[PDB]
């Protein structure tokens, strides 16, 4: 049992590195694969662009302090220390929307009271490193074995579909930049619907692929190796056909040039943590608790869910995961990072769940039936450190990246978000609104809990979510996680109270 | 068996007339069913569209007005004395491909010389009454038996071919006459939009298709849905290409009023007497093969329909009809010939669809196997209520103007796509290339060797390339004499090569 309490300090963090350490040159041994090179492919452009989208949008809200080579440094460098000592290496890292507003907030605060930004921060690093030592000293975290089933579909679900609406919104302000008339530059003709064909052509291929990797066609092995470069194959004939027209201009990926700070006349790599230009008052010293212990809950209720829905048991991992060594190192390398004015990271729940089930490898079952089950996970140490080195040095590059345009990227990037979907109990008891009670299929809940007392329970898990999006999208978005939070102890009375000890053993159970 | 051969010259036309038209009340009187209206509104919504998409084809291709207009108001013509004066009023008389390739042929022979024309084009409809008064009073019907699974496959698969191929040829030709340059022959976004707009319409009927036969909704509800797909995407597209406001697209050119002929003088009806120059002895007289290759195609189509529908398993208790059905078919497209008008014949899709449209299902608590006998709806009305209404949407042309001539490409996709599931060449054609452990339970697969069963199909696709090559290249006027000797090949080759066990689970009935 990972999450018991030993009852002596670093209990959890020796039982953690005493566990994983030993299967250590398996993990180096396990990336010799086919399935390892077409992994790094789809991982790099799903860590890379992102980067790129919020190092803009954090130095334009930030008068140029923070841009988008500050970011890429900082994902470089946190995963691959991460991939190099971390318990679970199926994580991957990388700057969220919470933590920009956050960021931006702060800022804001800053700019009224006339304080310094970078400098400021130093001591909210430093607060998060002695918060996260005390934390793992006295072992606080086994408060994980409290998030239920009914919290980390909530979660997943939620995020994944904010990752499709922020995909239908980009093309959106590409149409209204470029509207259909007729006669960086902006009102060019044919570019709308030159992007929305590459869009679709991208997603449509990765499907095609993938469907035709579980087929019958072809012998076995040619049949999984094409299937499992889908996307690669997708992408570079979308880039092919893009490159082939000569004469419609489309946004294409745009790079820095140089591993430089952004405004380099207003800021330097090291940050003094007493005064830049002016001495820092002491009291904010003091009263920088207060953002350290947000920002701390921020990056813990996201990596810890996130590790709760990837170490699930239908998923075949055995290898084991830290739910100790995990929380301290990505505090501590955010706190050391802050000293230099690189932001804080925590782990990505989408692009978790893409890297670790774009390794499963799914059984050979019978013609009929249903989905073949998973046979493994083949987990290492290899592919993540290689996608933080490549999104390092993807700055030397970039002659070459400058060759693709976005449009094709969000055919990948919808492809992704509708893909991990699946999986989730709530996904599926949604998939039952629609269906009549003669086509029910024959699952466990099904079975022993009465048709319409399993809708109720579907229902009020869709209130939990859209009141959680509503309290997202309003003003006040920073109390986001404490909502989150508050769903806990939801399940442990008023569900308890409203339902039998049957139904909610049959609904939500471990297994 | 009706085909048989009694000795009498109109021995067949009398046993076949005095087997339904004693049952004219019956079949004229029980209408008042509400099913049949729903049945209707099918039929209406699967026959008006390849109408008028056809009859778009024909005008932009012909150079003569033989848009829209004509071919609606021929099928209107053709189906109501079809419909009044015909046996199995079941069969919906439809336009399909090889009469398109074939009479596109045709016009190009006769406007590589300048001696031919309309009007030899009605020299060759009169041929068409010639023959087929001969064959039925010479009683040659029976030759249907010897057409079987071999040739009736290689047709379809080879005119599902033909449709797909139509519409990647229009796209094609839409991103040459507007190019994709930067800053009507040029208007900026009508390449894509097109695109566009043909991809969205084949996807949405797809999906519906898929969505028929899912496990939502009720299943009452789901199989009203799925069967309005057509006319669903075609709404939706026509309303998001109305929605935009200012993007040259093709529309539709249908002409408003009774139109024909508007530069020149004399009126619908063509004379075949000297209008501009002398018209030479052997290009009337001479001018008789076309008419036997038409006549061949129109008498597959009409019989292997007529057999498709009239199974024992389809079960029918009026009674059939083999002769009198070509006869006026024939007959009658040969003599409204010299009104113009483009020769019609019964297609199998519109009739299959009006026959499991118009049964009643299986009515039992036991679980669906199959529809029983129940009763069928035997009418003379719902044939009625189709052709007028598809006929008279003449005076509408202003609401037909607004549909784009894109989303009709998408729908001629949509139909060569879903045409092809049911024939074996299929079947055995996605066979070649799965691992031999993987093939299906099917009857054809146990009984022969792997081998034997890939050197068939590899036998039976170099008919299909042959016929093709010769379709396209100059001798695009005999295309129909190779179906015809492609019955002795099976009749004595391939009875030499493959053995009697395996020529008969390979080609059964």
């Not at 005493?18 to 299967?23: A, D, L, M």
């Not at 679709?200 to 990765?206: C, H, K, L, P």
């Not at 090291?270 to 010293?285: A, Q, R």
């Not at 350290?292 to 996130?306: D, H």
Request: proline residues 5%; hydrophobic residues 50%; contains cysteine.
């Amino acid at each position: 049992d990972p999450l018991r309490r030993t009852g002596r300090p670093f209990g959890g963090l020796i039982r953690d590195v005493r566990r994983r350490y030993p299967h250590y040159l398996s993990d180096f041994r396990d990336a010799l694969d086919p399935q390892c090179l077409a992994a790094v492919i789809f991982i790099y452009f799903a860590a890379l662009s992102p980067a790129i989208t919020f190092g803009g949008l954090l130095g334009e809200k930030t008068q140029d302090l923070i841009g988008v080579s500050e970011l890429i440094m900082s994902t470089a460098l946190q995963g691959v220390v991460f991939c190099l000592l971390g318990a679970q290496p199926l994580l991957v890292i990388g700057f969220s929307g919470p933590l920009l507003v956050f960021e931006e907030a702060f800022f804001s605060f800053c700019s009224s009271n006339h304080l310094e930004y970078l400098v400021g921060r130093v001591w909210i690093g430093f607060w998060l490193v002695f918060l996260a030592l005390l934390m793992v000293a006295l072992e606080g975290s086994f408060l994980v074995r409290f998030v239920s089933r009914f919290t980390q579909e909530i979660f997943a679900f939620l995020i994944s579909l904010i990752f499709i609406y922020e995909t239908f919104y980009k093309l959106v302000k590409i149409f209204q930049e470029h509207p259909l008339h007729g006669c960086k530059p902006r009102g060019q003709p044919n570019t709308a619907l030159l992007s929305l064909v590459l869009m679709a052509g991208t997603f449509f291929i990765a499907f095609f692929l993938r469907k035709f990797k579980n087929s019958r066609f072809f012998p076995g092995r040619i049949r999984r190796v094409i299937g499992d470069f889908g996307v690669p194959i997708a992408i570079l004939i979308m880039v092919l056909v893009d490159y082939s027209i000569e004469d419609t201009y489309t946004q294409k990926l745009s790079v820095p040039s140089g591993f430089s700070v952004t405004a380099p006349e207003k800021r330097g790599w090291v940050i003094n943590p007493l005064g830049e230009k002016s001495p820092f008052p002491v009291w904010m010293m003091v009263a920088s608790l207060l953002p350290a212990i947000l920002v701390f809950i921020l990056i813990f209720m996201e990596t810890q869910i996130t590790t709760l829905i990837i170490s699930k048991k239908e998923r075949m991992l055995q290898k084991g995961s830290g739910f100790h060594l995990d929380l301290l190192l990505i505090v501590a390398m955010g706190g050391i990072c802050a000293l230099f004015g690189l932001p804080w990271l925590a782990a990505a729940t989408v692009r978790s769940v893409t890297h670790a089930n774009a390794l499963t490898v799914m059984s050979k079952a019978v013609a009929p039936g249903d989905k073949p089950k998973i046979q493994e996970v083949k987990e290492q140490r290899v592919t993540g450190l290689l996608v933080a080195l490549l999104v390092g040095l993807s700055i030397v590059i970039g002659d070459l990246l400058r060759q693709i345009p976005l449009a094709v990227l969000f055919g990948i990037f919808l492809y992704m978000g509708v893909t991990s979907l699946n999986g989730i109990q709530f996904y599926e008891r949604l998939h039952l609104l629609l269906m009549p009670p003669k086509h029910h299929p024959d699952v466990t809940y099904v079975k022993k809990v009465r048709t319409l007392r399993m809708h109720l329970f579907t229902a009020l898990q869709l209130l939990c979510l859209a009141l959680l999006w509503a309290v997202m999208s309003t003003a006040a978005s920073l109390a986001f996680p404490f909502i989150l939070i508050l769903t806990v102890p939801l399940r442990m009375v008023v569900l308890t109270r409203i339902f039998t000890d049957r139904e909610m053993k049959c609904l939500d159970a471990n297994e």
